[PDB]
Structure formats: structure tokens, C-alpha cells
Symmetry: C6
Subunit: 215 residues, 6 copies
């Protein structure tokens, strides 16, 4: 990644085994459960495009997902190139060239060029731009592997209300890949006895009040 030293200047630092192992284990344990995405984002703080490819490459399984991610990346890179065409022809000696989609994705750029872009003034944050493309793809994957529709999350006749609400909002989080946009459907899919207590609370009950009322 790029971090600041005591100069205090922005410099490249090797990705640590600590970070590498964290990401590998998160994927191993959690697959594409939505809470994997914020972990990816935090572990890749300050990442160059090279670092981002490294993390993605250390994933052993899930190659269907990874191919879908590649397809999303290529789509975003094509759109980058539409929005910001780069001038062909030889570039000026010693000068910084403009990055195209493939440079941002780190397929056609060197680490040194990536470093140059990220630390220039003003900087071209190719690491942040590539990370956004990756998260866009990962969100699609989280939504694809979400196994259940919110419409099938209904409270069991013997299920405690809190356990039902946990399933409901966990399902909501995956179906929406942790992006916000509920109250009524939650009451509707409650079991008969809880639904009765809830309807009699009136509209605008907080979740706290609902869980209290059905405890």
C-alpha cells in the first residue's frame, strides 16, 4: 500500500503477511456473506491496483464469482475509457501518462506507474478508483449468492421474535448487498400472536418497542 513516513511523505510499503492472511481466512470462513465486503475494503486501505489484484488472486476457491468480478471490472474499465480517452502517440519524456481502464485495473501498468499516479499532485487515485469497481462487482456477487428472498422470511409459530428479526434483517442485508433504501413487511411476516400485539401498537413503533412488545 501507500502510507506516509516521517518526512512525512507518501511512500510504498509491502503488503503484510498479517493482511494477506486476514483476507484469505475471511473468505475461507465467510464466503460472500455481506460482511465480507467491508472487511475487504478495510484490509485494502491504501492499496495500489497491484495490491488489490494480489488480494483477489490469493482466493483459491469461488472461481465462478471471480470470473463474474472480472466481467464487472472489464465493464467499468470500458466505461472509464469512454469517459476519459487517453491520447495515443509517444508521450513526453519523463512525464506522467494518463491511465486508461486497464492501467487502473493494474493489467497494463507497472507498480512504479501506479505509485506515480497515487502520489502525484494532484494525485490520480487509481487504487481508490479500482477498489470502487471491485466492490461494485463483489456487491453483485453477494446479491447473487443470497440464498433466500425476504418474502420467505416468516416467523415460526414457536420462533422467538428476536430470532425472526435477526433472520429478516440478515436476509435484507444480503438481498441489498448492505446498501440501504420494511416495518410493514416485518409485521406482516410475524406469527399470529406477535402480529396481533404489533398491530395494536399502531404505526411508527420503533423496532425496540416492537421487540419489547413481543419478547
Amino acid at each position: 500500500p501507500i502510507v506516509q513516513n516521517l518526512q512525512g511523505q507518501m511512500v510504498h510499503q509491502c503488503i503484510s503477511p498479517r493482511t494477506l492472511n486476514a483476507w484469505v481466512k475471511v473468505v475461507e470462513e465467510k464466503a460472500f456473506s455481506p460482511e465480507v465486503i467491508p472487511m475487504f475494503s478495510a484490509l485494502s486501505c491504501g492499496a495500489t491496483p497491484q495490491d488489490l489484484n494480489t488480494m483477489l488472486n490469493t482466493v483459491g476457491g469461488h472461481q465462478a464469482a471471480m470470473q463474474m468480478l472480472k466481467e464487472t471490472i472489464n465493464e467499468e474499465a470500458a466505461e472509464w475509457d469512454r469517459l476519459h480517452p487517453v491520447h495515443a502517440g509517444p508521450i513526453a519524456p519523463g512525464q506522467m501518462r494518463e491511465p486508461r481502464g486497464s492501467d487502473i485495473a493494474g493489467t497494463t501498468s507497472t507498480l512504479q506507474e501506479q505509485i506515480g499516479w497515487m502520489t502525484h499532485n494532484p494525485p490520480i487515485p487509481v487504487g481508490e478508483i479500482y477498489k470502487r469497481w471491485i466492490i461494485l462487482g463483489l456487491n453483485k456477487i453477494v446479491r447473487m449468492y443470497s440464498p433466500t428472498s425476504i418474502l420467505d422470511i416468516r416467523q415460526g409459530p414457536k420462533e422467538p421474535f428476536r430470532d425472526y428479526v435477526d433472520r429478516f434483517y440478515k436476509t435484507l442485508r444480503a438481498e441489498q448487498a448492505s446498501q440501504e433504501v420494511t416495518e410493514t413487511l416485518l409485521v406482516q411476516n410475524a406469527n399470529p400472536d406477535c402480529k396481533t400485539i404489533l398491530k395494536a401498537l399502531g404505526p411508527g413503533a420503533t423496532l425496540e418497542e416492537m421487540m419489547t412488545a413481543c419478547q
Copy 2:
């Protein structure tokens, strides 16, 4: 988080895998037992609002609680906006804008803006302000999931006094979410033989003396 360097200046530093993993495991092992809250506070030392959202987002389960936390956060942010309205209209070029509730909660502010607020002179400590809102919500959650009333903590006929006092004050801590405001109820809920020894100690016995007397 924000830490000081050797300049020695306040600078942003990436959240470490060590911290990320600690928080994830604490929640996994302890749920919303009250001692989870001080762990959250210590692990989030120097946190930006982005860092705080990261930690909250890496929690996989407990989505009922998390939605309750969101509702508490939105309440505190609405109140912030009532107390400190921000001036609409274009802000002055190159100047720091005023944060509203959603900026403090990190929903509508960038990391760079958060950094600017936290390191300004005088600083606007948006990380500390957001952490207070979060702890307020987490305390509500700790109190909700407290499974037992202090009124049902009574010493078993064969239960050692120390084991009874452990249950009593552990229950007290959850019911009050580790916030202070006892002696008499502790004696009242003691078993017959211990209660006898305790009553004969008179008022104002220290807990030490009570546990000694019933050992």
C-alpha cells in the same frame, strides 16, 4: 484512526487487521454481554466515523440489534441537526464546512472531510461524537438482551454465597448496561441461613465483610 507521528503531527492510519479481528471475535464469543461495550470503546480508540462504520459492518450476525443501533444513531443525528443547523448554500472555496448528523455518522461525508474536522484547530471531534451515539445504542441493546431481572436472582439453598453475589452483580451490570446509580436487596435475596448471619451484622457491612461472614 488518527494518531500522532514524529513531527509530531495528527495523521490518518489504516485500521489494523489486529483490531479488526479482535472486534469480530469479541462479538462472536460474547454477544452483547456488557463487557463487550468497553472492549468496543477501547478497540475504536482514535476512530474516524469511517472506522466506526467498518467495525460495525464486520459484525455478521445480530442484525436485529444492528437495526436497533441504526435507529438510535438516526435519533442522535436528528437531535444534532436540531442543536446545530448547518447553513445551506454553496460553501466558501477551500474552507471547512459544518458537519451535520449524517456527516458525523459517516453517511454523507468523505474520509478526507472527517480527517479535516478531527485535526482542525480547534478540532470538531466527529469520531468521538459518533462513538458516543453508538455506545448509547449499544447500551440499549445490552439492556434489552439482559435475560434476567435482579428480582429473580436469589441464592440457592445450596449455593455458596460468593456464587450468588457473582450472579447478582453480573445481572445488575447488564440490567443497567454497566452504568451505576443494592445492599438491602442482596441480603433479602440471600438464603435463610446466610440472611440470618447477614441481618445480625447490622447495616453498613461492606461486601467484603458479608462474603467473609457467609463463607
Copy 3:
């Protein structure tokens, strides 16, 4: 905690997950065995009162002990206030105020005030003062939960002398909470055959010589 930087100046540093986890696990594994106390003291090197409360708060169980510790802390703070009354009335603008017991225990002081006291010249070491109060309380707890009197530590008819001496001095350490003030009682509680060998050594035998003689 407070540590020195390369300026090299005394600055506040966040408590590390490494330290937090160490303390939590020590208590989990060892309860209030006496060797827990020196571990507490070493893990809390350079601690502010805030850090000390953090460590104490991350303890999940043992709430009878923790309440006894609170009572000891309040006693020491009352005595601090007797010895060093603070002047009421508004304090001088921009000036350091005097800490009372509750400030030292970190109940009524901010981290910034604690930092100010600890780094002032001359410093008021509120972290060290609070740590002493805590260790005073923890020592009482170690002594309370000591399950056996030294008078009941007697060598088994088939127990090796070394195993008996281990139990004897381990019991002594708890009963005295690792504070020093023996030879004769150790011989007295030895089994018949070992006691015979020991009596014939005469007074002033070193433990080494005693263990050699009964090996």
C-alpha cells in the same frame, strides 16, 4: 498509555489489542490466583486511569470481586480527599486543576485532564496513584479467594517432599497476597520420616538443604 516518542516527548497512545487480549485471557485462565496481580501491573505499564478502567471493565465474570474492588477504590479515594482537599470555586482560565479521588479513579475526569496531570512538570502521576489503589483491592481479593489455610497444608504419607513444599509456599503466597513478612511450620507439617531427617539437620538449614535431605 503514556509513552515517550522520538521528540522525545511523553504522549498518549491507544491501548493495544495485544494488551487487552492478554489481560482478558489471564483472568479467564487464572482467576484471582496471586500471579494474576503482577501480570495486571505489567500489562498496565504507563496506564492512564481511563486505561485502568478499560482493563477492569473487560473482565466479564467475577462481579462479586469487582464490586469489592470498587469498594476498596472508593475507600482510597475518600482518603485521598481527606489528605488533599481541592479548592472549590471556578478555577483559573487555562490552568490545571487539582485532581480529587474521583478524578484519579477516572470517574469525573476526562482523558485530556488525565494526560495533562501525567505529563505536567512536575507531573501528578494519577495513573500510578490509581494503580496502587487497584492493586490494594486486588490483593484483598486474592486473600479472600485463597481456599486453604497454611495450617492445613501437611505432607502426605506418600507425598514427595518437593510436592509438599510447592503446596506450602503456593498457599503462603495466596494467604499473604504475594507480600512477604515459615521454616519451623514447614518442618512441623512434614510427614514423620521427613520430619525426622529435618529435625536432625538442626536449625538454620536452607530450603535447598532440606529438600536435598528429604529427596
Copy 4:
């Protein structure tokens, strides 16, 4: 490895136990699965040729592979020598000599000479050059130990489409040692019912659309 200090200058640093252990465990757990290669590359960030030999040498098993790697290294070093012959005869006192293949592979050069090359201006990046040779060899090994042809990856009659796509692209990755150059063969090797749905999608369906259509 070589890293920059606060001068901020390029200096040699000892390889850490953290890195050494990471590499050893990766090989132990994963053999020559393709995701091992990017892990090698990241763990060897900034590596001297000495560091690269160290990592390769700490591998205990897989000695057939290691001998194949040696043969690849010797081939690349022979080619280096063809392209960049070094002048025989005594070199100038105090001056940097030219590296030949065996110096780059660290068989005939000292750590001090390697350091000199890597930090000279302009530098001769012998660590990066040697790493490329090693990855070239490791890629051959990954391809050799790939147990299955893509032609034998066909969807089971009861196999979920996603599970089939995972096997297909994982096989592709090994057979090609994680180097890119598919859609049609993936449809062809699908089972009858999925193939029907897929053919009726028309050409140019994204993988996302295909997996959606066969879910």
C-alpha cells in the same frame, strides 16, 4: 528485503519470521495450487536473491518440483548471459561489477553485491529479475500438477450450475497457471437442462446472466 528508512533511504532488512512462516504454511496447505504463486510474489516483496533462495529452501517437500524450478532458473540464467555477457578480466577497484545469471540467482554473488546492485543509481534490480525467473518456473509446475483437463469438466446431472462453473474456472486457472488468453465450451459441457436454457439465451450472455438463468 530492501526497504526505505526515514532518511529516507533504501536499506537491507532481515526477512521476518512472520514472512518465513507464512510461506512455509502456504506451501504446506496448498501445494502448487495456482493461488500459491501470487502469495509467493507478495511475500517476497523487496526480496534480494538471497531472500528468494531462503524462501525456496525452507520448502521441505515437493523436491521434484524444486528440481524442475532449478532447471528453469538455469535456463533463464543461461539466456541472461547470452543477452548480457560480462567482461572478464580484473574489475576496477571499488567499482560495481556486472551481474551474470549466477549472480542474479544468488549462487555466485554476496548479499553485499546484491544490495549494491539493487540500490545503485540507476539500480540493476537483480531481485525483481530473479523473481521473474522463479515465477516462470513455478507457473510450469502449477500447470504440470493440474490434475484435470478442461475437457473433462462437465456438469453433473444433479450438480448445481454454480458448482459446475466453480470447477470449470478453477481448472482453467491451473491449466493456464493463472494467465489469461470459454463461453462456448462452458455451455457445451453444461448438463442437458441447463444447456437448453443457455442456448436459448443467445450469444453474448454474461456469466452473471447464465448463472441467474440456471440457478
Copy 5:
């Protein structure tokens, strides 16, 4: 411990959880096997007397040994006082006082005084002096708990020679607490067939040659 900073000056640093845990686990796993002593010495690199007491205090069991260690420490401190008597009477304002045995053992000195001695010019290395006393005691303990005499280490009729030599020199190391001062007794305690081969080698065979000859 005391380490140098970038000033680069000798400063006090808190003992790390890493070090604390290492020592605790070494004792837990290895007891007073001789290889425990060099581990103690290395883990206590740069230790103040306070740090040394900390490490000794975190040992939970083995209290017979610890009392023997205390007795050895008191003996060395008495001898220090004989060799270097300290002048009674009030010491000069602001000046460094002379350490007596109890100051070196850290029973009657503060951390600040210990720091002063260790960093003075010329320094009085109270940490190194105390460590020597401790190792002297630990060596006595290693020798006491050595369960077997070298005279009872004889090669089994079916025991491989290498396995016999391992037991022989491991026994030697404990009986001598890893202090050097053999060839003949090793041959004498060999089994009949190996002894025959060995006698016919003549005097002055290296161990290598002996183990080769009896393989």
C-alpha cells in the same frame, strides 16, 4: 526494559505482552529443564530489576523452586553489601545514591532509581547484576530437579547408539546446569556390542566417528 531510541538515547520501555507470555509458557511447558535458563536470559534482555521481578512473579507454580531462588538472591545481596557497603546518612540533594543488594534485587529501589543507575555515565548495571544472581539460583534449581545421575545412563541392549548419546548428554547438561568442565564413561556405559566397536576405534575418536561406527 531499557533500549535506545532514535536520539539515539537509552530509555525505559514497557515489558511487552509478547515477552510476558513467552516466559510464562516456557515455564509451563518445560519446568526447570536446562534449556529454560537461556530462554529466561534472552527474554530478559535489557531488563530492569523491576522487569526481572515481574517475570519471576508471573510464574504460578513451582513455589518450592521460587523460594530457593529467593534464598540464593538474598545470599548474593548479602555478599554485594559486604563487598560494596553504602554510606549511611542523608545523601546529597539531586545526586545518585549507591545501590545496596536490596536495591539491585528491586525490593528497596524505585523504577526511576533503577533507570538512573542503568543509564548513568558510567552506568551501574543493576539489571545485569541482578540477572546474574537469578541465573545462579536457577542453575541450582535445574541441578536439583535433574532426575537422573549420569552413572545410571546406560545403553539398552536394543537401544540405538544415537538414542543413548541423546540421553547421556541431556543428563549431563542438567546435572551440570548447562555449564561445561565424558568420552570414556560414554564408551563404558555403551552396550556390549557397541562397546566392542568403540574400544577398537582407539582413544581420541570424535563423537561423529563413534556414532558412525555404532550406527
Copy 6:
């Protein structure tokens, strides 16, 4: 070890628990398998003779090997003394003395003297010189405990060729203690069917081609 600081100067640093534990576990898990040697060399990067003795001393078992290592060390030290005799008589006040074999092995030199030699200009690298002696001894040990001759490594009638080549080169590595100096013996010890395929390849087949041909 000796490392450079930010001055940036060569200074002594305590050996870390991380390093100490790594070495101890490597020996525990791997004995004197050849890949242990490069691990020793890397873990002892920058080591003083004191550090080298520390690492060797933390090994609990294998005392036959350790005594053989001592004998090798004494041989190398005797030869050092033959090549570089040191002048007897009192050395000049404040001046650096010449190291003899026992100083390099750290038996008769202090840490301060070792530091002086290693950081002098020009330096006398006593750590590197001692490490070479140790590796020379360890290599002898690896060769001694090699359980099998390359002449007994023959392909099983049902053994896959790759599994045979793994055993062959692993045996070669131990018998030669990871020092290079094969093709023909590998074919000769192949099973009948593989030998046939191999002979018909002609001389000069690469191992890659051989393993391909017998897959």
C-alpha cells in the same frame, strides 16, 4: 542482533520472542531435516555470537547432535587460531583487541566486545564467521541423520513417477546437506515401464519432459 537505526547507525537490538519461538518450533517439528538449516540461517540474520549461542541453547533435545556441533565449532576455532594468532601481553588502553576462536564462538568474549568488532570500521564480522562454523557443523548433522542412501531409492511397481522423484531428490538433498555437485541413476532406479519410456527419450531430456513422459 545488530541492525541499523535512523541515524542511521548499526546498533544492538534484543533477540525477539518471535524469532526465539520460530527456531524452537522449527527444530521441534523438523529435527535435522535439511530445510532446517536455511531456516536457522534466516532466523539468525544479523546475529552476534551471543545470539547464536542463545538459539542453539534453546534447543531442548538432540543433545548428541549438539555435542557433535560443539566438536565442529572447536575444530574451526582451533583452525582460526592457527591462521590468525593473537598477540599476548596487555593490550593498549581503550583499543580493540583481536578476537581468537573462543571469542568468535562467544565463550570468552563479552557482548560489548562482540558489538565492537561487528560495528568497527572496517568491521570484523564475528557473527558471520561463527555462523559459518555452525552451519558447517549442522550440515554434518543433517548428513548423519539422513536415514537412506540414494542407492535404495527405487520406484515402486505401483508408485507414480512424481512420487518417486520427490523421494529421490529429497534423499539427495539430505545425503548432500543441500549442497549441489543424477539423471542416469534416476532413470536406472525407475520401474520397468517408466524406465522403458525414459530410455526411449534419449539423453538430455529435462526432468519436466521425463515427468511428463511418465505421468
